[PDB]
Structure 1
Amino acid sequence: KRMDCPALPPGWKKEEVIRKSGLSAGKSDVYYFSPSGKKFRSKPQLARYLGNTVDLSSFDFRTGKMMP
C-alpha cells in the first residue's frame, strides 16, 4: 500500500508495514517516501530533510494527520 499523504507536500507517500515475527509480531512500522523515493522512518529524520518548508509540530507520524 503506497498511499499519498495529503498533509505533506505533493508526491509524498506513506506506507504501513505489519511485522510478521519476533517479539513485535503484529505491531506496525510506518514509512514515508519523498517524491524522489528516499525512505523515512521517523519524524526527526523527516524534519531534518524538510527543514522550514513544512511545519511538522502537530504532525502525527503514525497516522499521517495533523493534530489540532
Structure 2
Amino acid sequence: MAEDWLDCPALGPGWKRREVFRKSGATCGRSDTYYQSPTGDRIRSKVELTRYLGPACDLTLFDFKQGILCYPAPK
C-alpha cells in the first residue's frame, strides 16, 4: 500500500519525497514527483509546497524530478 515514499533530501526530514514513472519506463520516461507533508497535505506544484511549508523550505530552483535545488548567492 504505497509507492516509493523515501526520505526527502532536498528539504530534509518530515517531508516525504515519492517519485513516479521513474523506475519502469524508457531511459527518458518522464518521472513525476509528488511530496507528502507531515500533516497530510500533498503538493505537486513544487513551489506550491514551498510556500506551504513556509520560509523553512524552498524549491524555487528545486527540480521537481531530480530532487535537487541550487541557489547562486541568495541576495
The normalised TM-score by structure 2 is 0.62
Number of equivalences: 63
User: In structure 2, which of residues 3, 7, 11 is the aligned counterpart of residue 8 of structure 1?
Assistant: 11
Structure 2, unpaired ranges of 5+:
22-28
Alignment deviations for residues 5-39 of structure 1 (CA, whole Å, 9 cap, x no partner): 12213111111223xxxxxxx54321011112321
Q: Which amino acid aligns with 2:16?
A: K
Identify the structure with the greater strand proportion: 1
Q: CA deviation at 1:48?
A: 2.6
The CA distance in 1 between the partners of 2:60 and 2:19, in whole Å, is 21
Identify the structure with the greater helix proportion: 1
C-alpha change, 1:48 and 1:28, in structure 2 (3 Å) is same
Paired residue secondary structure (2:35):
strand
Question: Are 2:62 and 1:59 equivalent residues in the alignment?
Answer: yes
Paired residue secondary structure (1:67):
coil
Alignment deviations for residues 18-64 of structure 1 (CA, whole Å, 9 cap, x no partner): 3xxxxxxx543210111123211111321230232223232112111
Let me know the Cα RMSD of the aligned residues: 2.4
Paired residue secondary structure (2:58):
coil
